[PDB]
Amino acid sequence: GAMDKLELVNDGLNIIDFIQKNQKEIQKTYGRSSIQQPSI
Amino acid sequence: TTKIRIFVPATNSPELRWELTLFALDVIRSPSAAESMKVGAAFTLISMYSERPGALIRSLLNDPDIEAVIIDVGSMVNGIPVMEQEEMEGLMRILKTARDSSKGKTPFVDSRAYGLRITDMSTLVSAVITIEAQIWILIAKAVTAPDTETRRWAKYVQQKRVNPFFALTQQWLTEMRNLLSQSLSVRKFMVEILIEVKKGGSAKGRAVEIISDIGNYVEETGMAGFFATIRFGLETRYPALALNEFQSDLNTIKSLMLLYREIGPRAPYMVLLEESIQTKFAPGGYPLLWSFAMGVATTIDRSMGALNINRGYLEPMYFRLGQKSARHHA
Ligand SMILES: [Br-]
Ligand SMILES: [Cl-]
Ligand SMILES: [Cl-]
Ligand SMILES: [Cl-]
Ligand SMILES: [Cl-]
Ligand SMILES: [Cl-]
């Protein structure tokens, strides 16, 4: 349905907003900041 | 601007519409018809399902690169519209050359269809839908990549929604498909009908059924990478999205997502419009996020197996990262 796709888009936008504002905190959460980095 | 002559039936008369339909068929296969006449005949065919085709075209024509002179046709003499001159003579040359041109062939696989007199409403509808369905199907194999047939037409037949008697020859359909490829206007107007049908508001049930089927196929196909990316790359909310390398792809897909919101229904049908926007939402514009999303999808969803294959933009390092992130979140 078109409704479900509109909700996908608005949730997609809120997710990107959250990431862009907390990108460093989430990188502590994730363990690294570059994909070229060893993960652990 | 570039004027376009569009002949339109003035009545619900089955016989008038059937001869008018045949004439339009003939213009498109005609050697001495200007591309402007052929464009008009496409409008005539594409709108023939509606109660009032001239009114359909006027209300929905949103296109600056063309001026439509819609011409009401109250009756046919010798297979050509009656006009209310040399202009009459021209429309004869269009039939004669269309006819003489080909090896006695008609636009129809069963030539009997070409000589047929229709006076019953349900036979007109059936013939008109069957012809229109085959034109819309051209639109369907255009949006796909040629990386795939007839399952389309065959489905409609077993479903009895289409009448195999009114099947068009390959030579005719190639004429039509050429016209679609070369003419932004016809596609643009078809896009209007796809939007109009989705809305919708007409009682031509069987027509808008088949147009919806196409319309929905065009949407699903062209936005499939976009929404898979959002659904499997964004919605899953994996912390790997905060890696520096994803940030430009995040900008891109944010711009695309805002686009989708302000354009509306027109957005999925961009794949049928001007060349430079056909690939607006294509995943090749955000390929690392796309590859990441692919890696998640094929890991967690049993319907997404197709995405294991590189169609050109797959970035193995980001695909693997998707698999790993999906395996890590149970
Ligand atoms: Br790809
Ligand atoms: Cl209608
Ligand atoms: Cl032909
Ligand atoms: Cl109908
Ligand atoms: Cl970077
Ligand atoms: Cl993760």
Coordinates of C-alpha atoms and ligand atoms in Angstrom, one line a residue:
Chain A
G1 CA 0.0 0.0 0.0
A2 CA 1.0 3.7 -0.4
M3 CA 0.4 4.5 3.3
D4 CA 2.9 1.9 4.4
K5 CA 5.5 3.3 1.9
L6 CA 4.9 6.9 3.2
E7 CA 5.6 5.7 6.8
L8 CA 8.7 4.0 5.5
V9 CA 10.0 7.3 4.1
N10 CA 9.2 9.4 7.2
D11 CA 10.8 6.7 9.4
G12 CA 13.8 6.6 7.1
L13 CA 14.1 10.4 7.5
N14 CA 14.0 10.3 11.3
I15 CA 16.6 7.5 11.3
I16 CA 19.1 9.5 9.2
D17 CA 18.4 12.6 11.4
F18 CA 19.2 10.6 14.5
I19 CA 22.4 9.2 13.1
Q20 CA 23.7 12.5 11.8
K21 CA 23.1 14.1 15.2
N22 CA 24.6 11.2 17.3
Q23 CA 27.1 9.8 14.8
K24 CA 30.0 9.8 17.4
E25 CA 28.1 8.3 20.3
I26 CA 26.9 5.5 18.0
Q27 CA 30.4 5.0 16.8
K28 CA 31.5 4.3 20.5
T29 CA 28.5 1.9 20.6
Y30 CA 29.6 0.3 17.4
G31 CA 33.4 0.2 18.2
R32 CA 34.8 2.1 15.2
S33 CA 34.3 5.0 12.9
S34 CA 35.8 3.8 9.6
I35 CA 35.0 0.5 7.8
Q36 CA 38.7 0.2 7.1
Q37 CA 39.2 -0.2 10.9
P38 CA 39.4 -3.5 12.8
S39 CA 36.2 -4.1 14.7
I40 CA 36.1 -5.1 18.4
Chain B
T1 CA 3.5 24.6 -30.1
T2 CA 3.9 21.3 -31.9
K3 CA 0.3 20.9 -32.7
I4 CA -1.1 17.3 -32.5
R5 CA -4.4 16.2 -34.2
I6 CA -6.5 13.9 -31.9
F7 CA -9.6 12.1 -33.3
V8 CA -12.1 11.2 -30.6
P9 CA -15.5 9.5 -30.8
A10 CA -18.5 11.8 -30.2
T11 CA -20.8 9.0 -29.1
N12 CA -20.9 5.7 -27.3
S13 CA -21.8 4.0 -30.6
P14 CA -20.0 0.7 -30.8
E15 CA -19.6 0.8 -34.5
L16 CA -18.2 4.3 -34.6
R17 CA -15.6 3.6 -31.9
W18 CA -14.6 0.3 -33.5
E19 CA -14.0 1.9 -36.9
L20 CA -12.2 4.8 -35.2
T21 CA -10.0 2.4 -33.3
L22 CA -9.1 0.6 -36.5
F23 CA -8.3 3.8 -38.3
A24 CA -5.9 4.8 -35.3
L25 CA -4.3 1.3 -35.6
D26 CA -3.8 2.1 -39.3
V27 CA -2.2 5.5 -38.8
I28 CA 0.4 4.1 -36.5
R29 CA 1.4 1.4 -39.1
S30 CA 1.1 4.0 -41.9
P31 CA 4.2 5.0 -43.9
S32 CA 2.9 8.4 -45.0
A33 CA 1.7 9.5 -41.6
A34 CA 3.6 12.3 -39.9
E35 CA 4.9 11.4 -36.4
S36 CA 2.5 14.0 -35.2
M37 CA -0.5 12.1 -36.6
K38 CA 0.8 8.9 -35.1
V39 CA 1.1 10.6 -31.6
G40 CA -2.5 11.7 -31.9
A41 CA -3.6 8.1 -32.8
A42 CA -1.9 6.8 -29.7
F43 CA -4.0 9.2 -27.6
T44 CA -7.1 8.0 -29.4
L45 CA -6.2 4.3 -28.7
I46 CA -5.1 4.9 -25.1
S47 CA -8.2 6.9 -24.2
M48 CA -10.9 4.8 -26.1
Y49 CA -11.9 3.0 -22.9
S50 CA -13.3 6.1 -21.3
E51 CA -16.9 7.4 -21.4
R52 CA -15.8 10.6 -23.0
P53 CA -12.2 10.4 -24.4
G54 CA -11.9 14.0 -25.6
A55 CA -12.8 15.2 -22.1
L56 CA -10.4 12.6 -20.7
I57 CA -7.5 14.1 -22.7
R58 CA -8.4 17.7 -22.0
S59 CA -8.7 17.3 -18.3
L60 CA -5.4 15.4 -18.0
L61 CA -3.1 16.8 -20.6
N62 CA -0.2 18.4 -18.7
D63 CA 2.4 19.0 -21.3
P64 CA 3.9 22.3 -22.6
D65 CA 5.8 20.8 -25.5
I66 CA 2.5 20.1 -27.4
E67 CA -0.8 21.6 -28.4
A68 CA -3.7 19.1 -28.8
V69 CA -6.4 19.9 -31.3
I70 CA -9.0 17.4 -30.3
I71 CA -11.4 16.6 -33.1
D72 CA -14.8 15.1 -32.5
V73 CA -15.8 12.3 -34.9
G74 CA -19.6 11.7 -35.4
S75 CA -19.3 9.2 -38.2
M76 CA -16.9 7.2 -40.4
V77 CA -17.1 6.9 -44.2
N78 CA -14.8 4.3 -45.8
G79 CA -12.8 3.7 -42.7
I80 CA -11.8 7.4 -42.2
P81 CA -13.3 10.1 -39.8
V82 CA -15.9 12.5 -41.3
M83 CA -15.0 16.1 -40.7
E84 CA -17.4 18.9 -39.9
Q85 CA -11.3 18.8 -48.4
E86 CA -7.7 17.7 -49.2
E87 CA -7.7 16.9 -45.5
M88 CA -10.2 14.1 -46.2
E89 CA -7.9 12.9 -49.0
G90 CA -4.9 12.9 -46.7
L91 CA -6.6 10.5 -44.3
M92 CA -7.3 8.3 -47.3
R93 CA -3.7 8.2 -48.3
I94 CA -2.8 7.2 -44.7
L95 CA -5.2 4.1 -45.0
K96 CA -4.1 3.2 -48.5
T97 CA -0.4 3.3 -47.9
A98 CA -0.9 1.5 -44.5
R99 CA -2.7 -1.2 -46.4
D100 CA -0.6 -1.4 -49.6
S101 CA 2.6 -1.2 -47.5
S102 CA 2.4 -4.6 -45.9
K103 CA 2.1 -8.0 -47.5
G104 CA -1.7 -7.9 -47.2
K105 CA -1.1 -8.1 -43.5
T106 CA -3.4 -6.4 -41.0
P107 CA -2.5 -5.1 -37.6
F108 CA -4.0 -8.3 -36.3
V109 CA -2.7 -11.9 -36.1
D110 CA -6.1 -13.1 -37.1
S111 CA -6.9 -10.9 -40.1
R112 CA -10.6 -11.6 -39.6
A113 CA -10.5 -9.1 -36.7
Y114 CA -9.6 -6.4 -39.2
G115 CA -12.7 -6.9 -41.3
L116 CA -15.0 -7.4 -38.4
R117 CA -18.2 -5.3 -37.9
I118 CA -18.9 -4.7 -34.2
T119 CA -22.3 -3.3 -33.1
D120 CA -22.6 -4.8 -29.6
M121 CA -21.3 -2.8 -26.6
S122 CA -19.6 -5.7 -24.8
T123 CA -17.7 -6.8 -27.9
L124 CA -16.4 -3.2 -28.3
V125 CA -15.3 -3.0 -24.7
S126 CA -13.6 -6.4 -25.0
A127 CA -11.8 -5.5 -28.2
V128 CA -10.9 -2.0 -26.9
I129 CA -9.5 -3.4 -23.6
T130 CA -7.6 -6.2 -25.4
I131 CA -5.9 -3.7 -27.8
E132 CA -5.2 -1.2 -25.0
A133 CA -3.8 -4.0 -22.7
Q134 CA -1.2 -4.9 -25.4
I135 CA -0.1 -1.3 -25.6
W136 CA 0.3 -0.9 -21.8
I137 CA 2.3 -4.2 -21.8
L138 CA 4.9 -2.4 -24.0
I139 CA 5.2 0.1 -21.1
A140 CA 5.8 -2.8 -18.8
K141 CA 8.8 -4.3 -20.7
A142 CA 10.3 -0.9 -21.1
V143 CA 10.8 -0.2 -17.4
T144 CA 12.4 -3.6 -16.8
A145 CA 16.0 -4.2 -17.8
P146 CA 16.1 -6.6 -20.7
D147 CA 17.5 -9.2 -18.2
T148 CA 14.4 -11.4 -18.3
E149 CA 8.3 -13.1 -22.5
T150 CA 4.6 -13.7 -22.7
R151 CA 3.5 -14.7 -19.1
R152 CA 1.8 -11.3 -19.1
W153 CA -0.6 -11.8 -22.0
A154 CA -1.1 -15.5 -21.2
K155 CA -2.2 -14.5 -17.6
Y156 CA -4.9 -12.2 -19.0
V157 CA -6.1 -14.9 -21.3
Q158 CA -6.6 -17.7 -18.8
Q159 CA -8.3 -15.0 -16.7
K160 CA -10.5 -14.2 -19.7
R161 CA -9.8 -10.5 -19.1
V162 CA -8.4 -10.2 -22.6
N163 CA -9.7 -11.6 -26.0
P164 CA -7.0 -13.5 -28.0
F165 CA -9.0 -12.8 -31.2
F166 CA -7.9 -9.1 -31.1
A167 CA -4.2 -9.9 -30.7
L168 CA -1.9 -7.5 -32.6
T169 CA 0.9 -8.6 -34.9
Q170 CA 4.5 -8.2 -33.8
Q171 CA 5.1 -5.8 -36.7
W172 CA 2.3 -3.6 -35.4
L173 CA 3.4 -3.7 -31.8
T174 CA 6.9 -2.9 -33.0
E175 CA 5.5 0.3 -34.6
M176 CA 3.7 1.2 -31.4
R177 CA 6.8 0.4 -29.3
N178 CA 9.0 2.5 -31.5
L179 CA 6.5 5.4 -31.1
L180 CA 6.6 5.0 -27.3
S181 CA 10.4 5.1 -27.3
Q182 CA 10.6 8.2 -29.5
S183 CA 7.8 10.2 -28.0
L184 CA 7.9 11.7 -24.5
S185 CA 4.4 13.1 -25.0
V186 CA 2.7 9.8 -25.3
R187 CA 4.5 8.4 -22.3
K188 CA 3.8 11.6 -20.3
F189 CA 0.1 11.3 -21.1
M190 CA 0.1 7.6 -20.2
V191 CA 1.7 8.6 -16.9
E192 CA -1.3 10.9 -16.3
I193 CA -3.6 8.0 -16.9
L194 CA -1.7 5.8 -14.5
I195 CA -2.0 8.6 -11.9
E196 CA -5.7 9.2 -12.8
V197 CA -6.5 5.4 -12.5
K198 CA -4.8 5.2 -9.1
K199 CA -7.0 8.0 -7.8
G200 CA -9.3 6.9 -9.4
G201 CA -13.0 7.5 -10.1
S202 CA -14.1 5.7 -13.3
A203 CA -16.7 2.9 -13.9
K204 CA -14.6 1.3 -16.6
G205 CA -13.7 -1.5 -14.2
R206 CA -12.0 -3.8 -16.7
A207 CA -9.9 -1.1 -18.2
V208 CA -8.6 0.4 -14.9
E209 CA -8.0 -3.2 -13.7
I210 CA -5.4 -3.8 -16.4
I211 CA -3.9 -0.3 -16.3
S212 CA -3.5 -0.7 -12.5
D213 CA -1.7 -4.0 -13.0
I214 CA 0.9 -2.3 -15.2
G215 CA 1.0 0.8 -13.0
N216 CA 1.7 -1.3 -10.0
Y217 CA 4.3 -3.3 -11.8
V218 CA 6.1 -0.1 -12.9
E219 CA 6.1 1.1 -9.3
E220 CA 7.3 -2.1 -7.7
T221 CA 10.1 -2.4 -10.3
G222 CA 11.6 1.1 -10.4
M223 CA 11.4 1.8 -6.6
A224 CA 12.4 -1.7 -5.5
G225 CA 16.0 -0.8 -4.7
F226 CA 15.0 2.4 -3.1
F227 CA 12.6 0.8 -0.7
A228 CA 14.7 -2.3 -0.1
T229 CA 17.4 0.2 0.9
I230 CA 15.2 2.0 3.3
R231 CA 13.6 -1.1 4.7
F232 CA 16.8 -3.2 5.1
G233 CA 19.5 -0.4 5.2
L234 CA 17.7 2.2 7.4
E235 CA 14.8 0.6 9.2
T236 CA 16.9 -2.1 10.8
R237 CA 18.8 0.7 12.7
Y238 CA 22.2 -0.9 12.8
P239 CA 24.9 1.2 14.4
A240 CA 27.2 0.5 11.4
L241 CA 25.2 3.3 9.6
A242 CA 27.3 5.7 11.6
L243 CA 30.5 4.7 9.8
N244 CA 32.1 7.7 8.0
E245 CA 31.8 5.9 4.7
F246 CA 28.1 5.8 4.7
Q247 CA 27.6 9.6 5.3
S248 CA 27.4 10.8 1.6
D249 CA 25.0 7.9 0.8
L250 CA 22.8 9.0 3.7
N251 CA 22.7 12.5 2.3
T252 CA 21.7 11.2 -1.1
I253 CA 18.9 9.0 0.2
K254 CA 17.6 11.8 2.5
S255 CA 17.3 14.0 -0.6
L256 CA 15.6 11.3 -2.5
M257 CA 13.2 10.5 0.4
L258 CA 12.2 14.2 0.7
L259 CA 11.7 14.2 -3.1
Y260 CA 9.3 11.3 -3.0
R261 CA 7.2 13.2 -0.4
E262 CA 6.8 16.4 -2.4
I263 CA 6.3 14.8 -5.9
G264 CA 3.8 12.2 -4.7
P265 CA 2.5 9.6 -7.1
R266 CA 4.4 11.0 -10.1
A267 CA 7.8 9.9 -8.5
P268 CA 7.6 6.1 -9.2
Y269 CA 6.6 6.8 -12.8
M270 CA 9.7 8.9 -13.4
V271 CA 11.3 5.7 -14.9
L272 CA 9.0 6.3 -18.0
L273 CA 9.7 10.0 -18.4
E274 CA 12.7 12.2 -19.5
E275 CA 16.0 10.2 -19.8
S276 CA 17.9 12.2 -17.2
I277 CA 15.4 11.5 -14.4
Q278 CA 14.5 7.8 -15.2
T279 CA 17.2 6.7 -12.7
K280 CA 16.5 9.3 -10.0
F281 CA 15.8 6.6 -7.4
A282 CA 18.1 3.9 -8.8
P283 CA 20.3 2.3 -6.1
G284 CA 23.4 3.0 -8.2
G285 CA 23.3 6.5 -6.8
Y286 CA 23.8 5.4 -3.2
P287 CA 25.7 2.1 -3.8
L288 CA 27.4 1.5 -0.5
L289 CA 24.2 1.9 1.5
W290 CA 22.6 -0.2 -1.2
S291 CA 25.3 -2.9 -1.0
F292 CA 25.0 -2.9 2.9
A293 CA 21.1 -3.2 2.5
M294 CA 21.5 -6.1 0.1
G295 CA 23.7 -7.9 2.6
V296 CA 21.1 -7.5 5.3
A297 CA 18.2 -8.4 3.1
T298 CA 19.6 -11.7 1.7
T299 CA 20.6 -12.7 5.2
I300 CA 17.3 -12.2 7.0
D301 CA 14.5 -12.3 4.4
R302 CA 13.8 -15.5 2.3
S303 CA 12.1 -13.5 -0.5
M304 CA 15.2 -11.4 -1.2
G305 CA 17.5 -14.1 -2.7
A306 CA 17.6 -12.2 -6.1
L307 CA 19.8 -9.6 -4.3
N308 CA 22.8 -12.1 -4.0
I309 CA 23.6 -11.2 -7.6
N310 CA 25.7 -8.3 -8.7
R311 CA 23.8 -6.1 -11.2
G312 CA 26.8 -3.8 -11.4
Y313 CA 26.8 -1.7 -8.3
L314 CA 27.4 -4.3 -5.6
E315 CA 30.2 -3.3 -3.3
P316 CA 31.4 -6.6 -1.7
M317 CA 32.9 -5.0 1.4
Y318 CA 29.6 -3.3 2.2
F319 CA 27.5 -6.4 1.3
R320 CA 29.6 -8.4 3.8
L321 CA 29.1 -5.7 6.4
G322 CA 25.4 -6.0 6.0
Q323 CA 25.6 -9.7 6.5
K324 CA 27.6 -9.3 9.6
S325 CA 25.4 -6.6 11.1
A326 CA 22.3 -8.8 10.4
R327 CA 23.9 -11.9 11.9
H328 CA 24.9 -9.8 15.0
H329 CA 21.4 -8.6 15.8
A330 CA 20.0 -12.1 16.1
Ligands
BR1 BR 23.5 -4.0 -8.1
CL2 CL -14.4 7.0 -17.8
CL3 CL 1.7 -3.6 -39.3
CL4 CL -14.2 -1.2 -19.1
CL5 CL 34.2 9.1 3.7
CL6 CL 25.8 -3.2 13.5

